Amino acid sequence: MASQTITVGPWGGPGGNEWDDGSYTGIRIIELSYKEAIGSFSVIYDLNGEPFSGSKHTSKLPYTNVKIELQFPEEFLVSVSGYTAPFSSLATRTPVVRSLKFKTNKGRTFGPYGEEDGTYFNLPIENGLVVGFKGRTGDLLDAIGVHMAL
Amino acid sequence: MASQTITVGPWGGPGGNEWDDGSYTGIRIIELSYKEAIGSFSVIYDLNGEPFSGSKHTSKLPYTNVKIELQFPEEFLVSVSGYTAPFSSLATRTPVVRSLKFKTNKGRTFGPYGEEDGTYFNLPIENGLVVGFKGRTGDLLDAIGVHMAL
Amino acid sequence: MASQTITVGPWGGPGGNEWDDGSYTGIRIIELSYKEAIGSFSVIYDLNGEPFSGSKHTSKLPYTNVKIELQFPEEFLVSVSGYTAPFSSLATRTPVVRSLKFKTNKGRTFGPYGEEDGTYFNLPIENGLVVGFKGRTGDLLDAIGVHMAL
Amino acid sequence: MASQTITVGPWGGPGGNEWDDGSYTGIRIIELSYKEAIGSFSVIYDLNGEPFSGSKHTSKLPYTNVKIELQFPEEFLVSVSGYTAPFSSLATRTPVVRSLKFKTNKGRTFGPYGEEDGTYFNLPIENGLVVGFKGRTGDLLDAIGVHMAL
Ligand SMILES: OC[C@H]1O[C@H](O)[C@@H](O)[C@@H](O)[C@@H]1O
Ligand SMILES: OC[C@H]1O[C@H](O)[C@@H](O)[C@@H](O)[C@@H]1O
Ligand SMILES: OC[C@H]1O[C@H](O)[C@@H](O)[C@@H](O)[C@@H]1O
Ligand SMILES: OC[C@H]1O[C@H](O)[C@@H](O)[C@@H](O)[C@@H]1O
Hints:
The structure is a homotetramer of 150-residue chains.
Chain A: E1 6-12, E2 17-20, E3 26-34, E4 38-47, E5 50-53, E6 64-69, E7 77-86, E8 95-104, E9 109-114, E10 119-127, E11 129-137, E12 141-149
Bound molecules: alpha-D-mannopyranose (4 copies).
One alpha-D-mannopyranose binds at residues 15-16, 90-92, 94, 96, 138-140, 142 of chain B.
């Protein structure tokens, strides 16, 4: 196939429908919505020094919207963490992403957003960069994973 | 300025002495000891098709020794997981690696070894290989981290 | 700072103005113009399975246009080669790219385009993929280099 | 399969017997022998901060031996270049490695060794590191290629 990157995760459940943004050169902006779990999730990547908009992974729920704006390129993620559990408001009870938190190399923290409820996942990055996301979304964020590169 | 890989981790605490095995072409044998926590941890890497013995990180503790023999190259790790916590019996209450578990692409599970107490960590690898480990060792395994390559 | 790739070259001289398309998932189309030397050079990359248009590095000179359409992703480049040297009136001081030739994994050759004069350059790729180009262009393609991944 | 690197080449002919040292962390020492072509060729690699000897690819011919010692890790190769052509004093008139030259980031040039006859090859490295060699040896060095990593 084409060029490719190291992929970790997914954390979360087998619900909703798969999506993969693919890889890019870094991250500029993450946009998510949240209440008791994570709803929407959408990313403005850097591609070779300019913004590139990933597909929107919108949840239909009326959740609070946040926009995490990184000082790209000198600021970048060193950690992604959160929790996974079901959220009872569904017909199926499969685990979903209840919370996300992000930390950066400058010591900014974004989140937690959502409810720190369930099982903990934590991706600390000692060397390397986050360069794309993938997940599964239905009414909300069922699962999340990350692509990495040097 | 020597060649680098993606490194994730570490998971555990600031105790003991740093070690870094660096990177190789894959994993052949993992060797560890356990009881209440992980003591010893050593690895036989693959280096360009032949075994390469990593440095030993051995604990003096009279622990149970286990040898994890992967059917290299067809079988490789797809998950590293475990638990970190203080171990009350150290002259310090700093967190160490209480448990480890390993899963492979053939569906085998090795562990849990040690005791599942404290904060869970989990690295599921969807695409990528483990090519090295780094860590910290005092009397026990204080921290572990993993290098990944395509 | 941002994601990086293996970069080889440049081949050619220090004239014209520098450009770098950066890196992508692979190559779909190369468009160039030629006569005595290479003029125009532009690329349609694959970005995560969709085409992405590289910046245009156009020559005004009335040269022959060629479009090289690979059957991506099954078909890819396995060799970039060419010749560099000064050219007559337009590039008297410094070498420019006089010719380019490309080989693919399916045994297609595209070119030589231009004239085979001066100093030979040859990049046979045994493993890895071309994921981007860089260069310098004035009236002509003064230089070219390649980013590679995998 | 297991971990891989980008590999460019080969330069030279199809004669002799193939060898492939694989990949490591970097380069400490190149040893070669030369007269009107390249004879012997062997490398002491860096592996995670200690030397690792590659297999000797020695020529029995009465040539001049040369040890290229880099100031590892701060000094590394940025260029491998040379010439290939058949060599009169041989039975098969396939091309062999006639000359090699090596440049470093420190500004040091080692070579040219042998004789600059036949077809030029030239790998300038703008980003990335040489982390192994592969080749072919009979009574002389028939071909050479390079593995590269970030
Ligand atoms: O997004 C959570 C939930 O949303 C909908 O109910 C469906 O798409 C489920 O599969 C999914 O698990
Ligand atoms: O390894 C567990 C423990 O061993 C010793 O007590 C010391 O090296 C500590 O720093 C360390 O935490
Ligand atoms: O591109 C060929 C030639 O075109 C112009 O003359 C300038 O932009 C030069 O610097 C360059 O070398
Ligand atoms: O290496 C030079 C030359 O030496 C030997 O004669 C053989 O292995 C040839 O195939 C090879 O071309």
